[PDB]
């Protein structure tokens, strides 16, 4: 069947064919005068994709962090877990200040001109929600991050209670929330199946209404991701191995297969048996990598910082505004903190792009924001490839360092 042949086709080879045929059609219709037809006919096939991406940002964020923070064992994270969560806190501080520097050296969105701050004691006091249901009903991503982590921790204090009724009740609540999380992981597969038509429509009406300087500046955001990404490999992981004695040249020759696997499959959780194979081939003992790789699958803020350091700068310069370094540090550190614990799930790109509109602060009713937010939702697939690639090699680096220290 034709529908079965269309679904059976792989997704990463489908969004790219959607994107190329979007850009070509939007150029050859944007030049030939037929452009008001695109905004009335093709644009609602992309607006539904933008709404489908924002439909599932909140149940993923709640039901993923509850079932994630209810997996924390306080006796498992004794010595190796502390070294890991100090390592990722060190590497995230390099990734933020390198994704900001590479967004500053490039100018993503300089010539796509289409055409008020709370204090630091207010944001950290607005993290705590006054109403958790009201934090879910509104947008309020970071309050439901906080309430989800608190509810996730407070269940494992009940599941090992001396009682049985509260233990059975806590198990049933955790299983219901885990079922909601798996349902929202199953929905994102159908949304990504719809994604070629949506990316086609979005980039088609963008190239139709603007022209060729969109692809001129869109071959700049991808460049500012990727040359900051390889630089974050060569200036962080290549020196963190050379400090701890392990030669980084043979490290890449070992981890090339896991890097290419994570590049193609576009998901760090799925490429885990390939990733543990390289860890076994590098002489790392079973317990070490068996603990650290499923931890680095979930909590690893390396690619998200490199993406949102340049995506927020592009969505700010494309909208006409202008940002300083101390004014965008407090936005990059907000988006990265909002995407915590939810970067290895299949719904990571949804939250990474929904924390861009909340980074601007303008709704999706104004046509200038909706014409610049689609421009990054076009190339999020090409960015997600390198994002997963730099996540997986960072996982391998943090396993190798801790294994060298323990051995």
Numbering used by the authors: 2 to 116, 126 to 417
Lines from the paper:
The guanidinium group of R397 remains between D390 and D394. In contrast, the helices restructure significantly in the apo conformations, particularly in GltPhIFS-Apo-open. Only in GltPhIFS-Apo-open, I350 replaces L347 because the HP2/TM8a motif, particularly the HP2 N-terminal arm, moves outward. In GltPhIFS-TFB-TBOA and GltPhIFS-Apo-open structures, the transport domain leans away from the scaffold far enough to open a window between the two domains that connects the interior of the bilayer to the solvent-filled crevice on the cytoplasmic side of the transporter. We observe excess densities in the opening, suggesting that lipids enter the space at a position structurally symmetric to LipidOut (LipidWindow).
Sodium and aspartate symporter GltPh is an archaeal homolog of human glutamate transporters, which clear the neurotransmitter glutamate from the synaptic cleft following rounds of neurotransmission. The crucial conformational transition from the outward-facing state (OFS), in which L-asp binding site is near the extracellular solution, into the inward-facing state (IFS), from which the substrate is released into the cytoplasm, involves a rigid-body ‘elevator-like’ movement of the transport domain by ca 15 Å across the lipid membrane. Here, we report a series of Cryo-EM structures of GltPh reconstituted into nanodiscs in the IFS and OFS.
